[PDB]
Design an enzyme around this catalytic site. Structure first.
Site, PDB file in Angstrom:
ATOM      1  N   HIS A  40      31.074 -10.664 -22.979  1.00 26.96           N
ATOM      2  CA  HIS A  40      29.664 -11.027 -23.053  1.00 26.96           C
ATOM      3  C   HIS A  40      29.500 -12.181 -24.036  1.00 26.96           C
ATOM      4  O   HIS A  40      29.661 -12.000 -25.246  1.00 26.96           O
ATOM      5  CB  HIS A  40      28.820  -9.838 -23.490  1.00 26.96           C
ATOM      6  CG  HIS A  40      27.348 -10.093 -23.404  1.00 26.96           C
ATOM      7  ND1 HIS A  40      26.725 -10.454 -22.228  1.00 26.96           N
ATOM      8  CD2 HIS A  40      26.377 -10.057 -24.348  1.00 26.96           C
ATOM      9  CE1 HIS A  40      25.432 -10.616 -22.449  1.00 26.96           C
ATOM     10  NE2 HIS A  40      25.194 -10.380 -23.727  1.00 26.96           N
ATOM     11  N   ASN A  66      25.861  -6.285 -29.989  1.00 26.34           N
ATOM     12  CA  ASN A  66      26.698  -7.469 -29.905  1.00 26.34           C
ATOM     13  C   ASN A  66      27.500  -7.643 -31.188  1.00 26.34           C
ATOM     14  O   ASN A  66      27.102  -7.151 -32.248  1.00 26.34           O
ATOM     15  CB  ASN A  66      25.823  -8.704 -29.662  1.00 26.34           C
ATOM     16  CG  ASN A  66      25.491  -8.905 -28.195  1.00 26.34           C
ATOM     17  OD1 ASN A  66      25.582 -10.011 -27.670  1.00 26.34           O
ATOM     18  ND2 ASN A  66      25.100  -7.828 -27.526  1.00 26.34           N
ATOM     19  N   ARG A 118      21.621 -11.703 -13.419  1.00 25.88           N
ATOM     20  CA  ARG A 118      21.131 -13.068 -13.556  1.00 25.88           C
ATOM     21  C   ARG A 118      21.807 -14.001 -12.555  1.00 25.88           C
ATOM     22  O   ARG A 118      21.142 -14.799 -11.887  1.00 25.88           O
ATOM     23  CB  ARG A 118      21.376 -13.567 -14.982  1.00 25.88           C
ATOM     24  CG  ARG A 118      20.401 -13.055 -16.033  1.00 25.88           C
ATOM     25  CD  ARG A 118      21.099 -12.886 -17.379  1.00 25.88           C
ATOM     26  NE  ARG A 118      20.168 -12.532 -18.449  1.00 25.88           N
ATOM     27  CZ  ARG A 118      20.519 -12.314 -19.712  1.00 25.88           C
ATOM     28  NH1 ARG A 118      21.786 -12.418 -20.077  1.00 25.88           N
ATOM     29  NH2 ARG A 118      19.598 -11.991 -20.610  1.00 25.88           N
TER      30      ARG A 118
END
Lengths: 308, 318, 308, 318
Positions: free
Chosen positions: A168, A113, A144
């Protein structure tokens, strides 16, 4: 004649979980790389023993030297910290270079990330085709979204199609409009009383914050079972040429109004990499959320360029 | 404790295929029944050998006696005549009347030996023989269904995936109504991971005529294969379809699958088995999904249910 | 970048069963070849539809032309009749030639009977390394020996080790002495009353005649579920470099006192083919039965040589 | 009908691994219990997400309450202290006395909420804590076992396969006795698909000293991994070992596996849990296999059971 070689750059929680998956699925020989001495070697011994229980022949090795990644068919990168950006940018630059020297024909899946930002740095430092470098995020955010929807309707997640595009992060873009139950519009199940519009709104936001929700519950660490399964499904789709439709962070050259950026969109992953970018018919409202989500990515990509 | 018991009534090519799938997937003990003496016993022995190659413990037995289905958790029925001889008179004075009578003795043996079993019919005219089997057995309507949609949809999905060059797993495609020429595939509900197929028309992956041809080829898929085979019918996809239904039950997977199930008002149908998208779970057919069909699609559907009605009427006459 | 290619020379009962297995296991793209027009194409359509149910992308195609086998990674041959020898020898010669032209780097698994005899004809007509041509029989005869033993002891066949060496036929050589339960000598279970010496003797003979037993029960045709699973386990062991220990008909150059012959013995199948021949410590009595079983093979190999 | 219910007492790295294996293998519903508030709930949510990637329907739940193990078909226990701190005094006044008391409350909660469950212990000193758990729960001795042999044998088998360059699947290797330094691997029973390993010594695949080193490395395997890891212990092979046992039960596979089971005269041991090769089936530990051990091997074994006896005596004192 050679078995597929899968190198995990980073042998942390996600990395080791991905190795187990690779061994359970006989996807190939697994190389766990990490900068922390011995640790990967120890996880590899544990995993090697697990193969006797699975009655497989999978070779799993741990290492602290990049030279062991030569000839990798797939590389999945979790190395980094969770002033984080310039640090990870340095590491991803180092990873990218080592890839270019040792295994330039590999298919490369980034997870570190900020995902979409770090994906482009990796590609830039690596030089490989934009087609065989990508980042995992959408598959995770989709799993999810799919799960939450599937729980409320009480159907198998297999039969729930849902997608998350964009970056993201907390401004990821779940697409309730494209959610389907075996191709049936989710709107139909509102009319029949299976789910309300308010619950969809809530699931959409819960999908946005799901990582933080897990982080808050775990107390120490972030999610990893599903992150790992997501990256491995992408890896499986490449190695077995499965031509799967999946949201991944991929290089865009005009689609969705983005150029020279990695962003989360639906693609077809096959034996040649990100073989096809799918261009959704977004509504104006959906295009806008997409454009706002990738704003941060555009700027940070430009900032990090300036600092090299 | 006990393993799940799966009995296959009819040990032809489909039945043997289902038994091989059950052994491969370790779904439970398998009972192969057939009227042909010894043959089921031969196939069971071959399959028993194979569990050694699969390193599984699966018990596979062959039998010519109904008493050995005692306590089946799932029964799957292929016995009877097939469409292969179709002789335009075959459907009417052979297939329909003969299979109805076998479905009755099969239903009675179920009622006597495994009344708590989930019953999956395959014998044709399926939608009709499911009614017969259900009435003859007296089992709950939600514990007796027919396999057809899954197979018809497996073909619809395959043809679609093939043209678009994506995995069949992301092609959602459904075929509803009756099995046979009256089946109603639904091009409008087809999606690529939730994306309407219309989006791929415009972006050039597919033309609508191709979609129309694929709808027709889906309707004629069985006859296409038979004409190619020379002898016999398809059995691999019929078998995997019924086992996917059987798996959804045995493992309570709550899978959405087009199956021939009993309607009690849904879609305007009353007291009749027909192909609709349903949820299969540990308790059987747990929910019928009532799609928001267009009038054109609903007309297609009603016409499909009417031909089913005619043949249950004709059979109820005798 | 290419998916593994598996060509089935012969699309009969065994052949089609092997194709289903290949599709269920995503081993590779499957090519069903047969001389009977349309039939393979029809089985392939049936199997292609089965992939939608298995949620796989496996390409399965039927054909009547040998040209479609080019580049096969694995070829498994059931073509033939069950004056049979000169006929099958002609067919196997034709198969072998087509292999040499179209896919000479393939791993080749013969099943046509008389197995061990037809294996050498294939290799001779094919010219490929003796290491990448072999015949399936022992795995099948072993799976029956293993199963029968496992049934009487009431343990999983996975935990029964048993082997059959020699020729595929009524004079195959089951080896009760080497039978083990997770490595425990079967003799130990005689002493404990799980099984008697007489029942082992009977199982040994039942293993010898098992094919005929099935043939008598089936009424029309021979066994095929287990024949197919056996050939596919050999194929799986090659394609995934699993290094499995299996009795197969393989080229011997001195081991067991045999030269220039394919005979059933334990080997290690890996990504390079029949990587290692294992030389069992046979007793004199076991060597003799082995020598008598392969007598027929020696003579027929010599007879067919004379007739070319 | 109901899915099988699997409860994991302790949601550490092993417990979470077992839950991921159960979800991957669709063995049943999974209950993750732990004393740490919220953490099990976090892991369950992560795993729930993963079932979407695995296209499975598996229910995974996290909980800090024993009431949610109600009706577990299998319980697998990792709770307690580990060997990692081993501080020579850790084993004696921490590991042993503390874990015994947790095994009692765990046993009582089992007796109250799932007395019909198959119970698989992992907490160390395993052979001892299995006794405690069994006595505290009052369950049938054949429905309570300990995982150790499978793991020790998984390592013994791996090391052997690695040297010989064959698949671990054809290496039959067993470790019997107690888990820990007193474990007794059996080089004499090791085979390559039934072939004695002696045959590969003579044919040069292996030397006996290598075999002796592999026996020792098997004994020290856990400590080898810990020293490499820096933090923590192995959890992948411990997890797969317990799940293989749990699978053998849930699917009545009748697998031969070295497990810590209750001896009632076998091997000369009376009323004591220790590691022996057994058959695991739908009814639990169904048969103890009494190997024809040489005197040397039996001495090794008896010494292994004596150290187990000492620690159950020391614990029974308090």
């Amino acid at each position: 004649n050679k078995r597929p070689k899968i190198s995990l750059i980073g042998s942390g929680m996600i990395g080791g979980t991905m190795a187990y998956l690779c061994a359970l699925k006989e996807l190939g020989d697994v190389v766990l790389f990490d900068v922390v001495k011995n640790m990967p070697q120890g996880k590899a011994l544990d995993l090697s023993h697990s193969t006797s229980v699975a009655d497989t022949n999978v070779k799993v090795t741990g290492t602290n030297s990049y030279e062991d990644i030569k000839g990798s068919d797939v590389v999945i990168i979790t190395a980094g910290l969770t002033d984080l950006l310039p640090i990870n940018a340095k590491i991803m630059k180092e990873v990218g270079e080592n890839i270019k020297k040792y295994c330039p024909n590999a298919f490369v899946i980034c997870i570190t990330n900020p995902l979409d930002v770090m994906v482009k740095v990796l590609q830039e430092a690596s030089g490989l085709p934009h087609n065989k470098v990508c980042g995992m995020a959408g598959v995770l955010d989709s799993s999810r979204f799919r799960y939450f929807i599937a729980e409320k309707l009480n159907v198998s997640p297999r039969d729930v199609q849902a997608m998350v595009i964009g970056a993201h992060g907390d401004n990821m873009v779940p697409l309730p409009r494209y959610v389907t139950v075996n191709g049936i519009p989710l709107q139909e199940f509102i009319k029949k009383g299976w789910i309300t519009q308010e619950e969809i709104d809530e699931i959409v936001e819960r999908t946005r914050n799901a990582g933080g929700e897990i982080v808050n519950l775990l107390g120490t660490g972030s999610a990893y079972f599903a992150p790992a399964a997501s990256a491995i499904a992408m890896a499986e789709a490449y190695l077995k040429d499965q031509k799967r439709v999946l949201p991944c962070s991929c290089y865009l050259e005009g689609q969705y109004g983005v150029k020279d950026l990695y962003v989360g969109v639906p693609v077809v992953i096959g034996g040649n990499g990100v073989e096809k970018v799918i261009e959704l018919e977004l509504t104006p409202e959906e295009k806008e959320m997409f454009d706002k989500s990738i704003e941060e990515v555009r700027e940070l990509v430009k900032a990090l360029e300036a600092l090299d």
